[PDB]
Amino acid sequence: MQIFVKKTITLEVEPSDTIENVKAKIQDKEGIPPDQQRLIFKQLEDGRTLSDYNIQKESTLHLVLR
Amino acid sequence: RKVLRDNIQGITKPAIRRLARRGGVKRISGLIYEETRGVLKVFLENVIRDAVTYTEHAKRKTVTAMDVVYALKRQGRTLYGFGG
Amino acid sequence: KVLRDNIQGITKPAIRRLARRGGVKRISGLIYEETRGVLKVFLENVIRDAVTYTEHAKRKTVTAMDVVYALKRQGRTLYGFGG
Amino acid sequence: TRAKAKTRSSRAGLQFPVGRVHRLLRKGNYAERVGAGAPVYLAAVLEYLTAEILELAGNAARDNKKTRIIPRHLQLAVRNDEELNKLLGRVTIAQGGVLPNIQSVLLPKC
Amino acid sequence: AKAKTRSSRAGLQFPVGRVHRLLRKGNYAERVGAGAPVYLAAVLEYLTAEILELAGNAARDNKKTRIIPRHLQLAVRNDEELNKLLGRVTIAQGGVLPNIQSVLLPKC
Amino acid sequence: KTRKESYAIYVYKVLKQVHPDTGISSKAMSIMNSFVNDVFERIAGEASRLAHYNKRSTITSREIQTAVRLLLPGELAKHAVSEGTKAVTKYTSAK
Amino acid sequence: RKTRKESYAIYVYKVLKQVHPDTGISSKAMSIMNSFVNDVFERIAGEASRLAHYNKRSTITSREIQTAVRLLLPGELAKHAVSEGTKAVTKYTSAK
Amino acid sequence: PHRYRPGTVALREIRRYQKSTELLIRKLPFQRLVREIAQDFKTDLRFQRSAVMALQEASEAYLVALFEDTNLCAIHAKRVTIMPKDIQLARRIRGERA
Amino acid sequence: KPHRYRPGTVALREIRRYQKSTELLIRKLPFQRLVREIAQDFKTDLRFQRSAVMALQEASEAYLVALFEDTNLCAIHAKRVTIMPKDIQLARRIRGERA
Amino acid sequence: LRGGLGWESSLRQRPMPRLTFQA
Amino acid sequence: LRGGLGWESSLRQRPMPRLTFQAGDPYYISKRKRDEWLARW
DNA sequence: ACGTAAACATCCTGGAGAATCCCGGTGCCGAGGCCGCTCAATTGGTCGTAGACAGCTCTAGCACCGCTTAAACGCACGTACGCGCTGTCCCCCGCGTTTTAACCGCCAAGGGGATTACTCCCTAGTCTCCAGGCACGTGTCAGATATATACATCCTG
DNA sequence: CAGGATGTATATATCTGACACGTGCCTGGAGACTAGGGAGTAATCCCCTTGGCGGTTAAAACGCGGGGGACAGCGCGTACGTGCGTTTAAGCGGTGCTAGAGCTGTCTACGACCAATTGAGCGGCCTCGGCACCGGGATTCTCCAGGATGTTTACGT
């Protein structure tokens, strides 16, 4: 399973993973702290999981710097 | 006869500015105050033709709100508030 | 038999030909996916109404009349199919 | 019995079926009752519209030196007329193609 | 015998009887069904309840106890489905949804 | 059996009256029939709405002419209604 | 003193008090809601009439209304609507 | 003396006019224009008081929605000033011009 | 030494050729298979007439071509020749499809 | 002009052509 | 979540908000400027 | 190689309007009770639409196999894109100052609409006849393919 | 800045034949000829709503002026989209072949039309209070320019 986060970021995830866990993936790859990231798919909160947002493989995620 | 300025100058520069600001545009060029007047005249001719046609068919000599709202609905722009 | 990855059927040269009949000269590479998504959305919108008409008619096949009348529903009425 | 029957279309000087238009108005339950002159008016308007469209289509076909009217000529005749294009603004014609035209800027200069 | 209104027996507040009369006198078909007015009245009631609930929430947000057409416009245009349903409708005295393009706003 | 009503013969008749030396394809004939049916439905629906305007239960030539005026844009309308008037002013002339 | 007019004002107010017990509605908003009810009713009824002319039928039964409402309202709205409508019809079956 | 930076009062006006819901066109000039334009179609026409209000309010909504679309065109061309070509192209795409 | 055409001028010949003709441009089998695949979710085990699929072909092609006419207008507006996906999105927004 | 055989007069002489606005 | 006192349950829960599509402001810049953001981040 | 100073470069901040909170007086208009009336619910009949059911057949889906054809891939290459720099210039934001929109009141009356009597046009219904749909049968005169040439573009001194 | 060559088009003449065009048959739909009765047509009147009048007067329009931010043009670097040659995955077509399911004729019966009764749900008519407007103060909130602390050259050695 794969998704795309817009710069364009490629992250491997799982259906039950939460946004904050996915938010940490950007930190490891791009070095951007999660607290300075606002994710768009509507804003996705850290606690809610990917499946709660109906996010599937190759989903369209957007990253805007704070 | 009211064919002196065609009364279209009534819709003036600050009025167009207010309408555009309500639209949500930061800056307005000076060549738009005539394009918007032309667009307004075209739209009002289009609507008033149908409204007056509805009035003429009903054998009455006044333009009621019903004719205007139903002409607008026919043109594809429904308008709530004045009946319907 | 289910089908998958069927939106790739609309191939790149077909999209280029459609654009050419549209009246363009140069096509950005990212067009060949946004326009596929647009076609998929339009087909969803038309097919949903066609299927609704077919279901109401208590029949199991989607006739051409249902398709053209669904098209007319969306303000895109089509001539040439016995409307 | 009665005299020799003759169609209302002959009375109206049309070859469009005013009787069939009257029957369609009655069976289409648009109104509780329909007047005698309403089908005549509808048939006349339909006749005029189809006559104009067919004449333009035939003119385009003879321009394309093709004496048989095909669906391609119909768009060439309809969209080339501004009033008819406005009438059929939200109408798509099967196998109609598009109007040959390219934007001025896209064309190369001298 | 004692007569109870059709809306009460259908569990509705919208007038099923008036809707049936409008369907009959509206010249939509030669005959109309018994359950058609019930279905149509229920649908109208549901739609009205939805838009009214959204408008009342907007009014509660705007510190007001009665609904102004501005509240109706704010409610209808803030819901994707409702706005799509009312995409070709101009509500009286409704104004517009307050939004700005991101380019116009200062960067920081 | 199972006859199908259509405007094919009338459309061909007006075609031959306006162009006595040309033909028409089957698909073109179907398109013309669909166009005639669609315009008929549009005008009749507008006439029905205009009848429902003034609490009138009948459809006359007056409101169908008004509907034609509303629908057809510009000069076309000014032609069509005139044509329609002719078709009436002679229809009552000879019975 | 005569020529009484018919409006959905009483019904709209009743459902409003069913949703928000402590919220009123102005006359302009009441007219907005009445016009909206009229417009949606006309849309659904006209589509049902055309959709009954569709299959050479003469009766606008509940099925025609359900199909029109499933084919006019967008998204889950339509879905929700039909459910509500079905419930109402079911009550008609239960109470006779 | 104090002077705002050219371009910030515009956002103030935008917010003020979007939050509010009054009528931005003077009622008397618009009514006079309506009477003048309807005079050509049929002379000696009387207008209901609520007929002109519906005419003006509906007309205002069309202009406002048009300016929203023409604002989108201006930004799309990498600008902030709306221009007559922006209105013309927005109308052409909307299907009104052609 | 081999003959080479300057870029941008073959596209004019292609534009004239596909604007003068009137036949279908998308291949029939992939479009029919796509239509079945997208309609199978609404109602399982569906059936389509030959004219039903062809009618969807004409509707899709007319819509796609008309959209590309408006897309070119947006791209020309931005003082450029190529067309970007944002041109398509803005053309859809102005028409009111994605508003 | 226009007309033609049994359609003498009537029709629409000099019809308005399409504009096709260019940007 | 929705509720509504008299209208217990039913209705619609979690309506989809309006998209309000924005023009060309995606915060997209050059990779060199983007690379400098990573160092700051 | 290598010192310090220098214009930019931007967090920090004082102070001048702008938008809020709150408090209070006040109307004007929702919410509600009241009388009535016209219209919806009851009950009964009748009757014809639409469920079902059974049969016939249309064609939709499925397959197989050649062929030939657009698609996919790669690969030079140029040219349109996008950023940057610069130079006008023309909307901006205020500051006076002119104009007239809006208000309030008064008046005259045009006609929108409701009432009442009339009449005649549309409908229902019978009966009869014929125009249009269907199935035959075309003879074709409209659609390809085999060639003969002009020529717009990309080379050339 | 004018000549040459090319793969693009123009035309001509053949087949070649699916196919619009006559042509019968006949049948269901249209026309002719009666009564019957409401829907529309006239005439009257009654509010009454619409138009037009004349003073404030203050809000909004209008004009002017400095200037700064945006528009527009030109230039440079590149990557990416196009034109072209070579497979190749698959479209297209041609022909059996089956059975699901679309049409269509019949019976029936059940749901809808409609008519006369009866009552109550809802429409209009006052009516009172309270929610929203508005006035203004004090209060924070935004936004501006300005002195102030880092920074990497750009000069030097």
Residue numbers in the entry:
A (entry chain D): 1 to 6, 11 to 45, 48 to 72
B (entry chain J): 19 to 102
C (entry chain Q): 20 to 102
D (entry chain K): 10 to 119
E (entry chain R): 12 to 119
F (entry chain M): 28 to 122
G (entry chain S): 27 to 122
H (entry chain I): 38 to 135
Q: Which of the paper's sentences describe this entry?
A:
In addition, NCPs were prepared with either wild-type (WT) or K119C-mutated histone H2A, with the latter further conjugated to the G76C-mutated ubiquitin via a dichloroacetone (DCA) linkage (hereafter referred to as H2AK119ub1). The structure of the DNMT3A1 UDR−H2AK119ub1 NCP complex reveals that two DNMT3A1 UDR molecules bind to one H2AK119ub1 NCP, with each occupying one histone surface. We were able to trace the DNMT3A1 residues L170-W210 on one surface but only L170-A192 on the other. Coincidently, cryo-EM density for H2AK119ub1-conjugated ubiquitin was only visible on the surface with DNMT3A1 UDR density more clearly defined, indicative of conformational flexibility of the corresponding region of DNMT3A1 UDR−H2AK119ub1 NCP complex. Residues L170-W210 of DNMT3A1 UDR traverse the histone surface, with its N-terminal segment forming a U-turn anchored to the H2A-H2B acidic patch, followed by an extended segment running through the surface groove formed by H2A’s C-terminal segment (α3-αC and C-terminal tail) and H3’s homodimeric interface, and a C-terminal α-helix sandwiched between nucleosomal DNA and H2AK119C-conjugated ubiquitin. Strikingly, the side chain of DNMT3A1 R181 inserts deep into the surface cavity formed by H2A E61, D90, E92 and L93, with the guanidium group of DNMT3A1 R181 engaging in salt-bridge interactions with the sidechain carboxylates of H2A E61, D90 and E92, reminiscent of the acidic patch-anchoring arginine observed for many other nucleosome-binding proteins. Immediately next to the DNMT3A1 R181-binding cavity, the guanidium group of DNMT3A1 R171 is anchored to a shallow cleft formed by H2A E61, E64 and L65 via salt-bridge interactions with the sidechain carboxylates of H2A E61 and E64, as well as van der Waals contacts with the side chain of H2A L93. Of note, the side chain of DNMT3A1 R187 inserts into the pocket formed by H2A E91 and N94, H3 E105, and R129′ and A135′ from the second H3 molecule (denoted by prime symbol) to engage in electrostatic and/or van der Waals contacts.
Isoform 1 of DNA methyltransferase DNMT3A (DNMT3A1) specifically recognizes nucleosome monoubiquitylated at histone H2A lysine-119 (H2AK119ub1) for establishment of DNA methylation. In mammals, establishment of DNA methylation is mainly achieved by de novo DNA methyltransferases DNMT3A and DNMT3B5. In addition, recent studies have identified that the N-terminal domain unique to DNMT3A1 harbors an ubiquitin-dependent recruitment (UDR) region that interacts with nucleosomes carrying histone H2A lysine 119 mono-ubiquitylation (H2AK119ub1), a repressive histone modification deposited by polycomb repression complex 1 (PRC1). Here we report the cryo-EM structure of DNMT3A1’s ubiquitin-dependent recruitment (UDR) fragment complexed with H2AK119ub1-modified nucleosome.
